[PDB]
Amino acid sequence: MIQVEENEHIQTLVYQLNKEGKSICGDSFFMKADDKELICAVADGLGSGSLANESSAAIKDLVENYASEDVESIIERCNQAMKNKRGATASILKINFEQRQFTYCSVGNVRFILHSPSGESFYPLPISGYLSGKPQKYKTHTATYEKGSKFIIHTDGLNVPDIRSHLKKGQSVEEISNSLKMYTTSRKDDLTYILGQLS
Ligand SMILES: [Mn+2]
Ligand SMILES: [Mn+2]
């Protein structure tokens, strides 16, 4: 499933496919942007199937409802919601268009790679473990981005040899998505990615 949306400040593309012969995606995503800010989140429920989706959809819903709060605060509420659920890995990203600034909070193997046309990249190593409901250290990265920045957030279903070069050489989220298409066909796992090109 490919979903594209743009406004003045960001062109986005979301790609989501279910694990082979599964009827429900274990991964979730949330995406909302208006003229001031963007919020998005990608979550991978443990395992797959409906109870993976139960955990990842609950994260999706919390991000939506608490979108006004800061990232750490939202991720906390997600951890709480994972009590007696399978749990999930997830990343949450807020962008303030007016300040060209982002805050990022993640737990587990969901990956965020930002590429700036000035060659600089932001590529935070993922926090170990998952959102299980147990007490969890959270870390927020806050940073300025450059006009023309290209980023991806993706679950571990997307395994690409050199994901940064794709972000570099592609000139639109469409181009980048197409260069990655060949890594999306195995269906060994649910596969979700968000691509953004920032004005
Ligand atoms: Mn999963
Ligand atoms: Mn996965």
Curated annotation (Swiss-Prot):
Pfam families: SpoIIE. InterPro entries: PPM-type-like_dom_sf (IPR036457), PPM-type_phosphatase-like_dom (IPR001932), Ptase_RsbX (IPR039248). The keyword Hydrolase applies. One of its GO terms (biological process) is response to heat. It is an enzyme of class 3 (hydrolase). It catalyses: O-phospho-L-serine + H2O = L-serine + phosphate; O-phospho-D-serine + H2O = D-serine + phosphate. Keywords: Hydrolase, Protein phosphatase. Its EC number is 3.1.3.3. GO terms for molecular function: L-phosphoserine phosphatase activity; phosphoprotein phosphatase activity. It comes from the Bacteria. Disulfide bonds: none annotated. Transmembrane segments: none annotated. Residues 11-198 form the PPM-type phosphatase domain. Negative regulator of sigma-B activity. Dephosphorylates RsbS. Plays a role both in maintaining low sigma-B activity during growth and in reestablishing prestress sigma-B activity after induction. Could have a negative feedback role by indirectly communicating sigma-B protein levels. This is Phosphoserine phosphatase RsbX.
